[PDB]
Every structure is written in C-alpha cells, then in structure tokens.
Amino acid sequence: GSGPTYCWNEANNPGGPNRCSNNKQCDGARTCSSSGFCQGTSRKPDPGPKGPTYCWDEAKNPGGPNRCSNSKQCDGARTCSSSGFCQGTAGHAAA
Ligand SMILES: [Cl-]
Ligand SMILES: [Cl-]
Ligand SMILES: [Cl-]
C-alpha cells in the first residue's frame, strides 16, 4: 500500500500468499509487480514498534476477538483497556 502505516496480511490473498492485482493487497510500502506478486519492503523495523506501523490481527486474540491482556495484542496505536478490550484508533493508513 501507500507506506509503512498501511497494514495488510498478504498470506490470505487471492491466488495465493503474496499474490496481487493492486497495491492495496500488499503490506506497508510494498506494491504489486507486473507478475502479480507483492514487492518491496513493508516497513523497517517489521514488526514496527507500538504505534501506527504496528500490525496485529485482533480477531485471532486468545481471549476472543478484540480482547487483550496487554497492548501488544492490539492493532497499531490501540491499547488494552482496564476491562480487557483493545481500544482507541489503530492509526493505520486507509490505503
Ligand atoms: Cl504510511
Ligand atoms: Cl485463490
Ligand atoms: Cl514498542
């Protein structure tokens, strides 16, 4: 996508892992090649520190979707509430 704050899981792409027809199907700053593969570097470091470059799929959390015991189980800049839910805005780019 557009840059390191764009988060996308390429494993599940149509046609197979890391395959694409558009830049939105590639993580971070990666873009779609002429042969239909994502190319480039998503971000440095990867994973990013907590903040807008941190990519995490909360749907898979062990306590249930969007449930947490620590803020590293929350996407982007989100943090763990006292009640054990991820909260705030992740801060990721839309594309
Ligand atoms: Cl970005
Ligand atoms: Cl497929
Ligand atoms: Cl961090």
Tab-separated table of C-alpha atoms and ligand atoms in Angstrom:
chain	number	residue	atom	x	y	z
A	1	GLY	CA	0.000	0.000	0.000
A	2	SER	CA	0.939	3.625	0.464
A	3	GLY	CA	3.538	3.356	3.204
A	4	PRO	CA	4.569	1.659	6.453
A	5	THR	CA	1.388	2.572	8.370
A	6	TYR	CA	-0.724	0.558	5.893
A	7	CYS	CA	-1.307	-2.947	7.326
A	8	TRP	CA	-2.347	-5.934	5.216
A	9	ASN	CA	-1.935	-9.689	5.688
A	10	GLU	CA	-0.683	-10.977	2.334
A	11	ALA	CA	-0.980	-14.652	3.384
A	12	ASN	CA	-4.668	-14.766	2.508
A	13	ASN	CA	-4.521	-13.009	-0.855
A	14	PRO	CA	-6.490	-14.175	-3.882
A	15	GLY	CA	-4.385	-16.592	-5.898
A	16	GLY	CA	-2.081	-17.406	-3.010
A	17	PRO	CA	0.217	-15.851	-0.460
A	18	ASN	CA	1.809	-12.596	-1.621
A	19	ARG	CA	-0.172	-12.515	-4.889
A	20	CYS	CA	-1.853	-9.325	-6.036
A	21	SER	CA	-3.584	-7.315	-8.679
A	22	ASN	CA	-3.375	-3.976	-6.836
A	23	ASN	CA	-1.143	-2.189	-4.346
A	24	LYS	CA	-3.815	-2.391	-1.600
A	25	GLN	CA	-3.173	-6.167	-1.413
A	26	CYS	CA	0.436	-5.586	-0.340
A	27	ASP	CA	1.576	-4.821	3.211
A	28	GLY	CA	3.048	-1.475	4.189
A	29	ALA	CA	5.061	0.229	1.445
A	30	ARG	CA	5.003	-2.878	-0.835
A	31	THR	CA	3.476	-2.617	-4.277
A	32	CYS	CA	2.136	-5.024	-6.893
A	33	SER	CA	4.591	-6.238	-9.537
A	34	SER	CA	3.945	-6.844	-13.214
A	35	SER	CA	3.938	-10.589	-12.456
A	36	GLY	CA	1.287	-10.284	-9.781
A	37	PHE	CA	3.469	-10.576	-6.684
A	38	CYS	CA	3.899	-8.036	-3.931
A	39	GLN	CA	7.363	-6.484	-3.941
A	40	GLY	CA	9.468	-4.154	-1.812
A	41	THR	CA	9.889	-3.710	1.927
A	42	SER	CA	6.757	-3.248	4.021
A	43	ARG	CA	8.427	-1.227	6.800
A	44	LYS	CA	11.638	-1.048	8.839
A	45	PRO	CA	11.625	-2.434	11.520
A	46	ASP	CA	8.997	-5.117	10.854
A	47	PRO	CA	7.106	-5.622	13.035
A	48	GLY	CA	7.046	-1.926	13.899
A	49	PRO	CA	7.126	-0.540	17.470
A	50	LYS	CA	3.710	0.111	19.026
A	51	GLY	CA	2.102	2.899	17.035
A	52	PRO	CA	0.763	3.323	13.511
A	53	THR	CA	3.232	0.851	11.936
A	54	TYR	CA	2.375	-1.979	14.354
A	55	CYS	CA	0.226	-4.605	12.563
A	56	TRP	CA	-1.846	-7.038	14.633
A	57	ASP	CA	-4.993	-9.028	13.780
A	58	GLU	CA	-7.148	-8.721	16.883
A	59	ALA	CA	-9.781	-11.128	15.529
A	60	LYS	CA	-7.471	-14.029	16.448
A	61	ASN	CA	-6.731	-12.991	20.022
A	62	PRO	CA	-6.634	-15.808	22.549
A	63	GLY	CA	-9.115	-14.163	24.875
A	64	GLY	CA	-11.564	-13.681	21.927
A	65	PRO	CA	-11.896	-11.074	19.105
A	66	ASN	CA	-10.588	-7.691	20.255
A	67	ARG	CA	-9.849	-8.995	23.796
A	68	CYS	CA	-6.468	-8.423	25.413
A	69	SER	CA	-4.322	-8.706	28.477
A	70	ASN	CA	-1.553	-6.488	27.036
A	71	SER	CA	-1.293	-3.757	24.447
A	72	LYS	CA	0.832	-5.867	22.064
A	73	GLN	CA	-2.391	-7.820	21.372
A	74	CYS	CA	-3.926	-4.611	19.962
A	75	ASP	CA	-3.512	-3.249	16.453
A	76	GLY	CA	-1.467	-0.128	15.739
A	77	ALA	CA	-1.614	2.508	18.457
A	78	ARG	CA	-4.505	0.740	20.283
A	79	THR	CA	-4.004	-0.200	23.911
A	80	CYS	CA	-5.606	-2.579	26.381
A	81	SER	CA	-8.463	-1.180	28.490
A	82	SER	CA	-8.919	-1.975	32.177
A	83	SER	CA	-11.778	-4.257	31.069
A	84	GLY	CA	-9.547	-6.234	28.686
A	85	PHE	CA	-10.647	-4.807	25.324
A	86	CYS	CA	-8.421	-3.206	22.704
A	87	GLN	CA	-9.237	0.488	22.466
A	88	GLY	CA	-8.545	3.704	20.547
A	89	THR	CA	-7.629	4.189	16.912
A	90	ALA	CA	-5.013	1.942	15.319
A	91	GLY	CA	-3.770	4.906	13.266
A	92	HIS	CA	-3.246	2.932	10.037
A	93	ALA	CA	-3.486	4.413	6.575
A	94	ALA	CA	-6.712	3.527	4.698
A	95	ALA	CA	-4.719	2.583	1.593
B	1	CL	CL	2.360	5.377	5.782
B	2	CL	CL	-7.451	-18.357	-4.558
B	3	CL	CL	7.098	-0.863	21.238
